[PDB]
Amino acid sequence: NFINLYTVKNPLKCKIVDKINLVRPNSPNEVYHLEINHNGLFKYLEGHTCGIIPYYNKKQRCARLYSISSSNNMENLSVAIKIHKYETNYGYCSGFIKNLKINDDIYLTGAHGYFNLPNDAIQKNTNFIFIATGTGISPYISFLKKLFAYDKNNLYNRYTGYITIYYGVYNEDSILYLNELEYFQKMYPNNINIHYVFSYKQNSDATSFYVQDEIYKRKTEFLNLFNNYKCELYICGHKSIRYKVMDILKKKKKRVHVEVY
Amino acid sequence: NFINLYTVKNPLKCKIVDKINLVRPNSPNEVYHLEINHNGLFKYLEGHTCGIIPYYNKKQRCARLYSISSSNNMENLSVAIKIHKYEQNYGYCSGFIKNLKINDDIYLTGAHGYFNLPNDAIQKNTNFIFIATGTGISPYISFLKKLFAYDKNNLYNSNYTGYITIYYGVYNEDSILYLNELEYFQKMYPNNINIHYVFSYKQNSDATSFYVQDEIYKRKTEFLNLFNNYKCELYICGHKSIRYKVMDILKKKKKRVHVEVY
Ligand SMILES: Cc1cc2nc3c(=O)[nH]c(=O)nc-3n(C[C@H](O)[C@H](O)[C@H](O)COP(=O)(O)OP(=O)(O)OC[C@H]3O[C@@H](n4cnc5c(N)ncnc54)[C@H](O)[C@@H]3O)c2cc1C
Ligand SMILES: Cc1cc2nc3c(=O)[nH]c(=O)nc-3n(C[C@H](O)[C@H](O)[C@H](O)COP(=O)(O)OP(=O)(O)OC[C@H]3O[C@@H](n4cnc5c(N)ncnc54)[C@H](O)[C@@H]3O)c2cc1C
Ligand SMILES: Nc1ncnc2c1ncn2[C@@H]1O[C@H](COP(=O)(O)O)[C@@H](O)[C@H]1OP(=O)(O)O
Ligand SMILES: Nc1ncnc2c1ncn2[C@@H]1O[C@H](COP(=O)(O)O)[C@@H](O)[C@H]1OP(=O)(O)O
Numbered sequence: 001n002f003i004n005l006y007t008v009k010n011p012l013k014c015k016i017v018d019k020i021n022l023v024r025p026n027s028p029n030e031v032y033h034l035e036i037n038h039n040g041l042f043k044y045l046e047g048h049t050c051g052i053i054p055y056y057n058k059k060q061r062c063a064r065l066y067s068i069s070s071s072n073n074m075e076n077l078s079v080a081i082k083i084h085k086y087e088t089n090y091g092y093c094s095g096f097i098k099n100l101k102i103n104d105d106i107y108l109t110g111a112h113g114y115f116n117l118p119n120d121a122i123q124k125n126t127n128f129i130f131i132a133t134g135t136g137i138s139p140y141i142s143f144l145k146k147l148f149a150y151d152k153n154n155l156y157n158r159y160t161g162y163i164t165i166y167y168g169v170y171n172e173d174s175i176l177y178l179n180e181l182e183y184f185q186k187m188y189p190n191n192i193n194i195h196y197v198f199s200y201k202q203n204s205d206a207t208s209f210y211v212q213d214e215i216y217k218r219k220t221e222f223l224n225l226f227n228n229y230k231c232e233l234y235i236c237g238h239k240s241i242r243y244k245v246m247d248i249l250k251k252k253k254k255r256v257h258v259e260v261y
Numbered sequence: 262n263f264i265n266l267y268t269v270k271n272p273l274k275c276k277i278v279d280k281i282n283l284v285r286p287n288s289p290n291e292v293y294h295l296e297i298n299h300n301g302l303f304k305y306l307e308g309h310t311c312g313i314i315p316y317y318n319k320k321q322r323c324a325r326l327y328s329i330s331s332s333n334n335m336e337n338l339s340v341a342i343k344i345h346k347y348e349q350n351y352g353y354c355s356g357f358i359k360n361l362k363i364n365d366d367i368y369l370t371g372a373h374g375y376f377n378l379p380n381d382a383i384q385k386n387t388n389f390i391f392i393a394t395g396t397g398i399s400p401y402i403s404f405l406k407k408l409f410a411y412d413k414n415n416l417y418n419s420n421y422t423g424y425i426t427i428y429y430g431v432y433n434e435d436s437i438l439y440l441n442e443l444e445y446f447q448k449m450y451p452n453n454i455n456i457h458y459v460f461s462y463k464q465n466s467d468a469t470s471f472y473v474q475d476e477i478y479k480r481k482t483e484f485l486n487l488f489n490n491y492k493c494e495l496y497i498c499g500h501k502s503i504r505y506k507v508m509d510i511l512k513k514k515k516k517r518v519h520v521e522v523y
């Protein structure tokens with residue numbers, strides 16, 4: 001419907017309005033939120049990704065997909081980008097965003113992906129299970145901005161479905177869009193619930209424990225949400241979540257959605 | 262030095278000699294081994310990456326890094342490429358490697374990386390800890406090929422007498438990449454190599470995640486003894502999560518630690 005409005009053959013010249021560090025000092029990561037002005041020319045649905053072409057102006061135009069973390073009604077679009085480090089050396093797109101200044105040009109490729117809300121969403125009050133690791137919160141934040149009618153400039157005013165979020169990051173300081181997730185939690189406590197799976201460990205020095213085996217730990221009530229409440233299931237993050245959750249479940253497959261990277 | 266001899270501006274025209282499926286049929290993964298003839302003109306050290314430009318000479322000229330899995334002395338270089346899918350669809354280079362035929366042109370770009378053996382290695386008989394997941398065994402396979410003087414045509418000449426400990430995480434038995442080579446080194450040099458495989462397939466649903474880090478944590482002291490008392494050069498290649506827990510057990514010695522995650 002909005003797919004390939006802009007390609008590498010014709011990218012859309014956009015402006016950076018703001019660049020915000022999504023994490024806090026006790027995070028080992030560095031991730032940036034970008035506010036991006038596109039003059040309303042960039043078209044996407046909630047949960048679409050966009051491509052950014054680093055250093056678009058030598059013959060090396062190489063796009064990287066990023067999940068849009070804003071709603072359609074918001075004039076500017078939001079994106080959330082992990083900066084990758086090795087040795088300090090940076091990833092190709094990662095270093096481009098590291099050096100991005102306010103009001104720099106950024107060149108975007110048109111809507112990508114099918115990781116979208118069903119068209120009936122606010123009407124039929126459809127229940128949702130969202131599963132995320134790291135930057136994979138981005139498409140779910142976009143969903144929540146649509147459903148809960150989010151406005152940063154109108155937060156004191158006013159869908160009745162039930163949303164269970166299973167989110168996996170390192171620690172408290174590594175929860176991306178923490179302000180928003182707390183706001184939805186505070187304003188809608190009978191409509192939203194968030195299970196945080198932290199991958200650091202303090203008291204115990206135990207095994208590995210991720211978002212999948214937290215879902216496995218309470219596998220009955222999770223299957224109850226999917227069966228009794230007719231939930232749309234969403235998986236976004238690392239590929240290991242796919243099989244471990246899908247084998248808990250094993251015609252009704254159209255309710256499951258996956259975008260792994 | 263061999264770094265950046267070829268770039269996207271001037272890539273080396275090479276040819277595909279073989280294309281071998283590296284996984285056995287109980288693997289959910291799809292990995293091809295490419296034997297690549299470069300006419301002797303691609304210079305590298307063991308552990309170096311090469312860049313492949315898909316569709317050179319779709320529109321874009323964009324390189325992807327892959328670890329060389331053969332030693333310098335061999336005529337053709339080799340490489341191991343996992344085919345990435347998503348459901349309706351392949352990754353950019355993945356689709357290009359999928360559709361590759363024998364005698365096709367493939368364009369390489371220079372040696373990249375610093376994930377190498379120290380120059381002293383055979384002469385000093387230095388000890389080694391190699392930690393790998395998935396395609397991350399590739400630089401270690403080329404290491405073992407240099408160290409034990411591997412010859413496919415003369416498998417029936419090794420001067421290296423140190424100890425190599427490999428920890429290797431894949432899905433299952435059938436997902437072990439270079440099983441042929443790894444089982445040969447076990448068989449031919451059983452006092453110089455030991456390999457612990459850590460399979461992520463639980464074979465029993467009532468279990469939590471147990472990855473290659475957790476085996477190192479199960480073998481806490483034994484790992485520490487290798488690094489401290491045997492002066493091991495430590496190598497990490499694969500998933501990003503391996504870095505933190507391994508550093509957490511171990512904490513001047515930093516230049517003995519080598520990290521190449523993707
Ligand atoms: C559907 C989809 C949605 C996505 N959504 C998001 C999102 O919302 N947010 C987000 O942050 N990302 C997202 N990604 C991933 C995004 O494309 C990554 O930022 C990108 O893959 C990393 O790009 P890079 O150019 O910075 O790293 P690259 O240069 O492309 O390299 C990839 C990795 O290898 C490492 N590396 C590169 N060169 C070397 C070297 N020479 N030696 C050792 N290591 C090296 C880098 O550290 C990096 O981790 C998404 C991907 C997909 C496919
Ligand atoms: C130091 C270094 C060494 C490496 N060594 C090896 C190696 O030895 N062997 C190996 O196999 N790999 C290795 N890699 C990774 C290698 O670069 C990968 O092939 C590459 O990252 C995947 O790129 P691709 O062109 O195949 O797919 P890309 O499209 O470039 O990668 C993006 C990923 O996201 C997914 N994706 C792409 N488009 C979409 C979309 N539209 N919607 C949803 N998902 C999408 C794909 O499945 C893919 O997994 C190494 C990386 C580094 C940096
Ligand atoms: N195989 C996996 N399955 C699920 N979660 C994972 C896996 N590997 C790492 N993670 C966790 O995902 C979260 C965010 O991912 P990323 O590191 O890509 O930003 C981190 O908490 C990370 O934990 P860890 O701290 O063990 O790396
Ligand atoms: N965070 C992690 N740390 C270590 N190993 C991992 C992590 N996540 C996945 N793996 C495992 O590494 C192996 C190869 O990874 P890949 O296929 O991504 O190259 C797989 O068995 C995979 O397990 P899993 O099967 O749970 O994904």
Ligand code: NA
Nearest residue numbers: 394395499500
């Ligand atoms: Na891996």
